[PDB]
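Dear H.,

Thanks for agreeing to be a second pair of eyes. The structure we're designing against is below in token form, covering all 354 positions.
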């Protein structure tokens, strides 16, 4: 089954080429379920016309109002106000953004709004087969926006609290989440070995039944160098390109569980360079893009068979992955089990007599 969206043909990651995830075969089984919820734990969302119908009420765990860029600390509105950082902000020695992002040489730089959470959310669940824009992996699934990244990023504590809340666990000062998510997408990370703050939250949500999918990182470095990609009990995802080859930037190593489309990925975005402006579509690169191909595939796996455990989900993802092509720059010790194949991973529960 294929959707009719105008730009779907440019979304090679969904197609059945050597590098693609082979979604049309999966979509013959299921195009998702509104009872399966994927949490996009990220910069927040824009109510893009090609996305908003699949977005649930979420939460905003950014504690610092300066980073939050929305007039307050934690709040119940996960809309993305923009995460831009001006040159004056990053260079102000008396300001809250001083040297908050540095390049290879240790020099500060400025950035426009990324709308990164809107791009990631569109890969999971853009409104599909509606004759416009892009498609998502789960056409009918719901997306729980959990905003944890603001101007110059986010804090470990806010991200770990967002993780707990996303899965339906308690966080002090936050209301209960009536839409617990069974798949949690983390297209983010930072340096250092896996903090106990992350590992405690991960183990709590996994035991609650959630699958945690995390970007391996973009430093052409060992995946051991980036958390939460280097944590236990997560699915770390490396990025490959349209030819099934290792992305130049992807982190690699023994902890990577699978590779997925992460180069030239078209999805929903916004045209604003600071505050929100018009809906748009944009092509991004990163392990951030590979991660929602895997998380969306899990959402379809659960729509097709709601009884699968996180352990069974990982085993099926890896067993159904395609071997890396010759000359890919990938191996099963560096890029996970193979190339993501949703068409092979998604399997309907058994039918039975009545
Ligand atoms: Ca706020
Ligand atoms: Ca907010
Ligand atoms: Ca669409």
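And this is the sequence the design step returned. I haven't edited it by hand at all.
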């Amino acid at each position: 089954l294929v959707p009719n969206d105008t730009r779907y043909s440019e979304q090679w990651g969904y197609a059945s080429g050597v590098g693609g995830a082979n979604l049309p075969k999966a979509w013959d089984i299921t195009t998702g379920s509104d009872k399966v919820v994927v949490a996009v734990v990220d910069t927040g969302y824009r109510p893009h016309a090609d996305l908003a119908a699949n977005i649930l009420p979420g939460y905003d765990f950014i504690s610092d109002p300066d980073s939050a860029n929305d007039g307050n600390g934690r709040d119940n509105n996960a809309a993305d106000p923009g995460d831009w950082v001006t040159q004056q902000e990053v260079d102000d020695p008396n300001g809250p953004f001083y040297r908050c992002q540095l390049d290879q040489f240790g020099n500060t730089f400025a950035s426009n709004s990324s709308w990164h959470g809107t791009h990631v959310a569109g890969t999971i669940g853009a409104v599909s087969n509606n004759g416009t824009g892009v498609a998502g992996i789960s056409w009918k699934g719901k997306i729980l926006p959990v905003r944890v990244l603001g101007k110059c990023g986010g804090t470990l504590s806010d991200i770990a609290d967002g993780m707990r809340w996303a899965a339906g666990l308690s966080v002090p000062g936050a209301p209960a989440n009536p839409n617990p998510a069974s798949v949690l997408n983390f297209s983010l990370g930072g340096g250092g070995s896996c903090s106990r703050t992350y590992q405690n939250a991960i183990n709590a949500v996994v035991a609650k039944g959630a699958t945690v999918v995390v970007a391996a990182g973009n430093e052409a470095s060992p995946v051991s160098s980036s958390q939460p990609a280097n944590c236990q009990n997560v699915i770390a995802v490396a990025a490959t390109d349209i030819n099934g080859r290792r992305a130049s930037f992807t982190n690699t190593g023994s902890l990577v569980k699978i590779a997925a489309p992460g180069v030239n990925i078209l999805s929903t975005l916004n045209s604003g360079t600071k505050s929100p402006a018009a809906d748009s579509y944009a092509s991004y690169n990163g392990t951030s893009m590979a991660t929602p191909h895997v998380a969306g595939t899990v959402a379809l796996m659960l729509a097709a068979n709601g009884s699968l455990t996180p352990s069974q989900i990982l085993q099926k993802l890896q067993a159904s992955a395609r071997p890396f092509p010759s000359g890919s720059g990938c191996s099963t010790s560096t890029c996970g089990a193979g190339l993501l194949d949703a068409g092979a991973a998604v399997n309907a529960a058994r039918q039975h007599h009545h």
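Two observations from my side: Residues 240 and 292 are 13 Å apart (CA to CA). The radius of gyration is 19 Å.

Warmly,
E.
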